[PDB]
Design a protein around this ligand. Structure first.
Ligand SMILES: Nc1ncnc2c1ncn2[C@@H]1O[C@H](COP(=O)(O)OP(=O)(O)OP(=O)(O)O)[C@@H](O)[C@H]1O
Ligand SMILES: [Mg+2]
Lengths: 393, 51
């Protein structure tokens, strides 16, 4: 509460013990003094009737205006509801830390002096963008990533959890992370897991949502997305499917390509530009990283680049177990037979296999899923391959 | 009948009392105050009668 800034070594040290012991001693003195003085005289009546004078000063029918500009000398230009603007005086009982252009102020009825400020709604974009606890699951579900989980933790979680490690070495944490891999490997899953396991305001936006239909709205959306990310203390901004907005940036293009490029430039500036970015961490996922902009994924912009490979032999078993955990199975399931094939199977493919097997068991009315059911579901899932056989091979 | 006549005789000066604005309540707050939108005017932070 506006307490002294220790600014001692800032690492556990005897100097930091001494500065802290001193604060405790002074606080003990103040507490004893206030307690004894309250016992001697309550002063509750004195504290009251000052509020009565304040209420007298601010009449009964307080009007709601809109602060427009502070002349910085306890004066302001405030706009009434009709639209008129008045040059009034900011009285002394109004908490001036709340005043900012556009705030909803309370104005005196006769003299229009600023006599208070009203709280404002809490959804610029926060309710739309924030994900709350990720409905999917905690870190338990993710299977076989391990090293990628460790990298993500070292990027986003560790700075908030143990910052002393960074402050000791004097290095600032890595700026951002980009998750790249073939479609269906777990980028969004890991992002959601860290979102639900973290203590910071987590925001998610899909790149297709930044392709607005009106000029300048994509840039405005990115500007406001990063605007309500410093307003919410520590935050993590996860721009899923960046490939939609970021691209090689070929100059010779016409149409909405120019607007997409301008949106990308605004995002670039937000990631690293003239101003300091405060305390905000950026995660990005992209099935296709080779088509991105070198300026967009340059080191100072995105430090860490995590690769998500297709599950090979045992990660596959782990996902199968995880997705069949809450599902009764007959004692004839050859999950090893299912996974043994080198079919480039993805985790999303495994999830679809499990869901379809359960669905067809339900269709047949059975009470347990069978190995033949799993095999037929897998065959149906792998039926969605397409392409040409001889071509390319 | 007498009460009717008396009411109709005091009604002439009862009808010159000012009307009352009709507003839409946004949310109660504070000690006893309320936030009200008096259309077409702006909002107000008004008190509440003791009743
Ligand atoms: N290793 C894994 N463990 C558990 N589930 C997985 C794993 N890999 C993929 N999945 C499943 O894949 C489903 C698809 O979402 P996921 O987060 O995996 O996609 P993605 O890798 O981000 O894909 P895309 O690149 O298309 O966005 C998730 O619901 C999750 O159930
Ligand atoms: Mg994804």
């Amino acid at each position: 509460a506006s307490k002294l800034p220790l600014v001692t070594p800032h690492t556990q040290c005897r100097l930091k013990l001494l500065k802290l012991e001193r604060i405790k001693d002074y606080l003990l003195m103040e507490e004893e003094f206030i307690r004894n003085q309250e016992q001697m005289k309550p002063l509750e009546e004195k504290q009251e009737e000052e509020r009565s004078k304040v209420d007298d000063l601010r009449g009964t029918p307080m009007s709601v205006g809109t602060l427009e500009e502070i002349i910085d000398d306890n004066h302001a230009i405030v706009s009434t509801s009709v639209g008129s603007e008045h040059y009034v005086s900011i009285l002394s009982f109004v908490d001036k830390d709340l005043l900012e252009p556009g705030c909803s102020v309370l104005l005196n009825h006769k003299v229009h002096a600023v006599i208070g400020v009203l709280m404002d709604d809490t959804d610029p974009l926060v309710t739309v963008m924030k994900v709350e606890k990720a409905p999917q699951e905690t870190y338990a579900d993710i299977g076989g990533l391990d090293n990628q989980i460790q990298e993500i933790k070292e990027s986003v979680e560790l700075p908030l959890t143990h910052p002393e490690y960074y402050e000791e070495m004097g290095i600032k944490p890595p700026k951002g992370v980009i998750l790249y891999g073939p479609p269906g490997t777990g980028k969004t899953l890991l992002a959601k897991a860290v979102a639900n396991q973290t203590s910071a305001t987590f925001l998610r936006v899909v790149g297709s949502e930044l392709i607005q239909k009106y000029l300048g709205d994509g840039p405005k959306l990115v500007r406001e997305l990063f605007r309500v990310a410093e307003e919410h203390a520590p935050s993590i901004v996860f721009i899923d499917e960046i490939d939609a907005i970021g691209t090689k940036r070929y100059d010779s293009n016409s149409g909405g390509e120019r607007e997409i490029q301008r949106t990308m430039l605004e995002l670039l500036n937000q990631l690293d530009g003239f101003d300091s970015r405060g305390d905000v961490k950026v995660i990005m996922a992209t099935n296709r990283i080779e088509t991105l902009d070198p300026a967009l994924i340059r080191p100072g912009r995105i430090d860490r680049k995590i690769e998500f490979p297709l599950p090979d032999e045992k990660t596959k078993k782990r996902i199968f177990q995880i997705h069949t955990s809450r599902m009764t199975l007959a004692d004839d399931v050859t999950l090893d037979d299912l996974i043994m094939a080198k079919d480039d199977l993805s985790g999303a493919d495994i999830k679809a296999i499990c869901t379809e097997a359960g669905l067809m068991a339900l269709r047949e009315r059975r009470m347990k899923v069978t190995n033949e059911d799993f095999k037929k579901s897998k065959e149906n899932v792998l039926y969605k391959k397409q392409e040409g056989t001889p071509e390319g091979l | 009948l007498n009460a009717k006549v008396r009411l109709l005789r005091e009604e002439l000066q009862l009808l010159q009392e000012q009307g009352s604005y009709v507003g839409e309540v946004v949310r109660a707050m504070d000690k006893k105050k309320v936030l009200v939108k008096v259309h077409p005017e702006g909002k107000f932070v008004v008190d509440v009668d003791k009743n």
